[PDB]
Amino acid sequence: ADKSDLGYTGLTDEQAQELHSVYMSGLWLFSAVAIVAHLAVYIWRPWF
Amino acid sequence: ADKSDLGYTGLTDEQAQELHSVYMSGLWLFSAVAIVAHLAVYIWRPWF
Amino acid sequence: ADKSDLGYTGLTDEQAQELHSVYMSGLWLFSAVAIVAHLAVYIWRPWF
Amino acid sequence: ADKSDLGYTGLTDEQAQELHSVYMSGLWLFSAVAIVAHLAVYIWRPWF
Amino acid sequence: ALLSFERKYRVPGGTLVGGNLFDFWVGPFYVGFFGVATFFFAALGIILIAWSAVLQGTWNPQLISVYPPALEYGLGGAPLAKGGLWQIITICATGAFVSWALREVEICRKLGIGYHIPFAFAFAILAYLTLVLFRPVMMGAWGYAFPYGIWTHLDWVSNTGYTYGNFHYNPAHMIAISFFFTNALALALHGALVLSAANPEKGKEMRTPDHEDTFFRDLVGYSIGTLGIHRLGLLLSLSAVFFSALCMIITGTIWFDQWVDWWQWWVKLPWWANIPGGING
Amino acid sequence: DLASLAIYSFWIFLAGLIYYLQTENMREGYPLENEDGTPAANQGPFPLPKPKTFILPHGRGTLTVPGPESEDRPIALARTAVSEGFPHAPTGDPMKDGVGPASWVARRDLPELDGHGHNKIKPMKAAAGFHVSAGKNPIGLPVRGCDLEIAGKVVDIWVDIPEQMARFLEVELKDGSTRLLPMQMVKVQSNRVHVNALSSDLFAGIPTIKSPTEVTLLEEDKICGYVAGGLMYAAPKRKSVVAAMLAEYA
Amino acid sequence: WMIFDPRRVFVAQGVFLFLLAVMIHLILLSTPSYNWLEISAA
Amino acid sequence: WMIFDPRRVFVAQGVFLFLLAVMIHLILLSTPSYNWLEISAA
Amino acid sequence: WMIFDPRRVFVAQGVFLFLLAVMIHLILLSTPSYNWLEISAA
Amino acid sequence: WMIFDPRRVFVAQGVFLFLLAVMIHLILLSTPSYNWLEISAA
Amino acid sequence: WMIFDPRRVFVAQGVFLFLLAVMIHLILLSTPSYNWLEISAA
Amino acid sequence: WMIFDPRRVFVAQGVFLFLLAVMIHLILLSTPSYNWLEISAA
Amino acid sequence: WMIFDPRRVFVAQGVFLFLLAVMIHLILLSTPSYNWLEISAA
Amino acid sequence: ADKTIFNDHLNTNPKTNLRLWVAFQMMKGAGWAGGVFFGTLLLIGFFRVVGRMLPIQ
Amino acid sequence: AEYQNIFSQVQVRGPADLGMTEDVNLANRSGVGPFSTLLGWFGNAQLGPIYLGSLGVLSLFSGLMWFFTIGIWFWYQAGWNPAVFLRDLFFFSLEPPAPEYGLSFAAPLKEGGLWLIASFFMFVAVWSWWGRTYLRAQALGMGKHTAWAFLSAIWLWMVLGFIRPILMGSWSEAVPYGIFSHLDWTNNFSLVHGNLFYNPFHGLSIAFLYGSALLFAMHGATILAVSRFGGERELEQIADRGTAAERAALFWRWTMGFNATMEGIHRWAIWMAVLVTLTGGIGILLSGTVVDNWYVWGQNHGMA
Ligand code: BCL
Ligand code: BCL
Ligand code: BCL
Ligand SMILES: CC[C@H]1c2cc3[nH]c4c(c3C)C(=O)[C@H](C(=O)OC)c4c3nc(cc4[nH]c(cc(n2)[C@@H]1C)c(C(C)=O)c4C)[C@@H](C)[C@@H]3CCC(=O)OC/C=C(\C)CCC[C@H](C)CCC[C@H](C)CCCC(C)C
Ligand SMILES: CC[C@H]1c2cc3[nH]c4c(c3C)C(=O)[C@H](C(=O)OC)c4c3nc(cc4[nH]c(cc(n2)[C@@H]1C)c(C(C)=O)c4C)[C@@H](C)[C@@H]3CCC(=O)OC/C=C(\C)CCC[C@H](C)CCC[C@H](C)CCCC(C)C
Ligand SMILES: COC(C)(C)C/C=C/C(C)=C/C=C/C(C)=C/C=C/C(C)=C\C=C\C=C(C)\C=C\C=C(/C)CC/C=C(\C)CCC=C(C)C
Ligand SMILES: [Fe+2]
Distance (Å, whole) CA F201 – CA F145: 8
Which of E93, E101, E98 has its CA nearest to residue E49?
Answer: E93
Strands (E) in chain L, as ranges, are none
Enumerate the β-bridge partners of residue F90. Answer: F77
CA-proximal residue: ligand 2, atom 50 (nearest): O126
Distances (CA, A) of G32 to E22, G27, G29: 52, 9, 9
Shared domain check, E14 and E148: yes
Question: Peptide bond before A7: cis, by omega within 30 degrees of 0?
Answer: yes
- Establish if E25 touches chain H: CB-CB under 8 angstroms: yes
- Establish if F25 touches chain A: CB-CB under 8 angstroms: no
Task: Say which residues have a Cβ less than 8 Å from residue F73's Cβ, sequence separation at least 6.
Answer: F104, F105, F106
Which of F205, F124, F109 has its CA nearest to residue F168?
Answer: F124
Residue N15 backbone zone (phi > 0: left; psi -120 to 50: alpha; other: beta): left
How many residues comprise chain D? 48
Distance (Å, whole) CA E227 – CA E236: 15
Distance (Å, whole) CA H36 – CA H17: 22
Phi, psi of F119 (to 5 degrees): -80, 180
- Establish if F85 touches chain I: CB-CB under 8 angstroms: no
Say how many Å lie between the first and final Cα of chain N, rounded: 65
Contact status, residue F81 vs residue E13, Cβ threshold 8 Å: no
State which H helix or E strand residue O82 sits in.
helix O82-85
Domain boundaries, chain A: 5-48
Number of domains chain K contains: 1
Q: Which domain holds residue G6?
A: 1-42
Task: Say which residues have a Cβ less than 8 Å from residue F237's Cβ, sequence separation at least 6.
Answer: N6
How remote is the CA of residue O280 from the centroid of ligand 2, in Å?
8
Contact status, residue G9 vs residue D22, Cβ threshold 8 Å: yes
Question: Peptide bond before E90: cis, by omega within 30 degrees of 0?
Answer: no
Name the structure determination technique. X-ray
Distance (Å, whole) CA O92 – CA E278: 7
Distances (CA, A) of L36 to A16, D45, L22, L28, L29: 65, 16, 16, 10, 10
Angle at alpha carbon of residue H25, lines to H23 and H26, rounded to 5°: 80
Q: Which ligand is nearest to the CA of E173?
A: 1
Q: According to the annotation, is C21 in a ligand binding site?
A: no
Query: Residue type at O45?
Result: A
CA-proximal residue: ligand 2, atom 62 (nearest): O280
- Concatenated DSSP letters for F58-75? T------SS---SS-S--
How many residues comprise chain A? 48
Q: Nearest chain I residue to E40 by CA: give it.
A: I19
Contact status, residue O50 vs residue O30, Cβ threshold 8 Å: yes
Which of F128, F117, F77 has its CA nearest to residue F99?
Answer: F77
- Establish if B6 touches chain D: CB-CB under 8 angstroms: yes
Contact status, residue C22 vs residue J10, Cβ threshold 8 Å: yes
Enumerate the β-bridge partners of residue F113. Answer: F119
Long-range contacts of O79-86 (CB under 8 A, 24+ apart): O79/E275, O79/E277, O79/E278, O79/E281, O81/E277, O83/E271, O83/E272, O83/E275, O83/E277, O84/E272, O84/E275, O84/E277, O84/E278, O84/E281
Which of E41, F72, L26 has its CA nearest to residue G31?
Answer: L26
Question: Count of CB atoms within 10 A of residue E198's CB?
Answer: 21
Start and end residues for every CATH 3.90.50.10 domain found in chain F? 107-238
In a domain, E277, yes or no: no
Task: Say which residues have a Cβ less than 8 Å from residue O295's Cβ, sequence separation at least 6.
Answer: O194, O195, O197, O198
CATH number at residue G35: 4.10.220.20
Pick from H4, H5, H15, H37 the residue to mutate for testing the B interface (most B CBs within 10 Å). H5
Which of E94, E116, E95 has its CA nearest to residue E238?
Answer: E116
Question: Count of CB atoms within 10 A of residue O168's CB?
Answer: 11
List the CATH code of the domain at F107-238: 3.90.50.10
Alpha helices in chain F (DSSP H): 18-25, 226-229
- Concatenated DSSP letters for F151-167? --EE----B-SSS----
Distance (Å, whole) CA F9 – CA E1: 36
Distance (Å, whole) CA E103 – CA E97: 10
This PDB structure is determined at a resolution in Å of 7.8
Question: Count of CB atoms within 10 A of residue E112's CB?
Answer: 26
Distance (Å, whole) CA O73 – CA O67: 10
Distance (Å, whole) CA O22 – CA N1: 68
CA dihedral D12, D16, D17, D22 (to 10 degrees): 160
Buried b (16+ CB within 10 A) or exposed e, F23-46: bbbbbbbbbbbbbbbbbbbbbbeb
Distances (CA, A) of E66 to C6, E78, I29, J4, O129: 49, 12, 15, 39, 50
Shared domain check, E177 and E106: no
Task: Say which residues have a Cβ less than 8 Å from residue F26's Cβ, sequence separation at least 6.
Answer: F43, F44, F46, F47, F48, F49, O258, O260, O261, O264
Question: Count of CB atoms within 10 A of residue M21's CB?
Answer: 9
C-alpha count within 13 angstroms, C-beta hemisphere, residue E270: 0
Distance (Å, whole) CA O156 – CA O144: 20
Q: What share of chain G is helix, strand, coil (3-state, %, to 5)?
A: 35, 0, 65
Q: 3-state class of M15 per DSSP?
A: helix
Shared domain check, E154 and E173: no
Question: Peptide bond before F98: cis, by omega within 30 degrees of 0?
Answer: no
Give how far C43 is from chain J: nearest CA, Å.
12
Buried b (16+ CB within 10 A) or exposed e, E102-111: bbbbbbbbbb
Distance (Å, whole) CA O75 – CA O88: 9
Contact status, residue O216 vs residue E233, Cβ threshold 8 Å: yes
Q: Which ligand is nearest to the CA of E36?
A: 4
State which H helix or E strand residue F77 sits in.
strand F77-78
Q: Give H 11-30 residues with CB within 8 A of chain G.
A: 13, 16, 19-20
CA-proximal residue: ligand 2, atom 56 (nearest): O206
Task: Say which residues have a Cβ less than 8 Å from residue I13's Cβ, sequence separation at least 6.
Answer: A26
CB-nearest to G36 from D21, D22, D45 is: D45
Angle at alpha carbon of residue D25, lines to D21 and D29, rounded to 5°: 160
Handedness of CA M11, M17, M19, M20 (dihedral sign): positive
Buried b (16+ CB within 10 A) or exposed e, E9-25: bbbbbbbeeeebbbbbb
Distance (Å, whole) CA I21 – CA M15: 64
Which residue of E100, E105, E239 sits with most ligand 4 atoms within 8 Å of its CB, as the best mutation to test the pocket?
A: E100
Residues in contact with ligand 5 by the CB-under-6-Å rule are E 181, 184-185, 188-189, 219-220; O 59-60, 63-64, 67, 125-126, 129, 133, 146-147, 149-150, 152-153, 273, 276-277
Question: Peptide bond before F73: cis, by omega within 30 degrees of 0?
Answer: no
CATH number at residue N15: 1.20.5.920
CATH number at residue E184: 1.20.85.10
Contact status, residue O194 vs residue O295, Cβ threshold 8 Å: yes
Distance (Å, whole) CA O131 – CA O133: 5
Shared domain check, E187 and E84: no
Contact status, residue A38 vs residue H31, Cβ threshold 8 Å: no
Distance (Å, whole) CA E272 – CA O84: 7
Strands F153-154 and F171-172: antiparallel
Distances (CA, A) of M13 to E66, M9, O9: 57, 5, 50
Strands lying side by side in the sheet with F141-142: F141-142, F153-154, F171-172
- Concatenated DSSP letters for chain E? --BSSTTTT--S--S-SS-SSS----TTS--STTHHHHHHHHHHHGGGGTSTTTTTS-SSTTT-------SSS-SS---STTTTTHHHHHHHHHHHHHHHHSSSHHHHTTS---SSSTTTSTTTHHHHGGGTTSSTTTSSSTTS----SSSTTTTTTSTTS-TTS-TTS-HHHHHTTTTTTTTTTTTTTTSSSSSSSSSSSSSPPPP-TTTTTTTSTTTSS----SSSSSTTTTTSSSSTTTTTSSSSSSSSSS--S-GGGSTTSSS--STTSS---SS--
Angle at alpha carbon of residue O79, lines to O73 and O85, rounded to 5°: 60
Distances (CA, A) of F36 to B1, F73, M12: 11, 13, 50
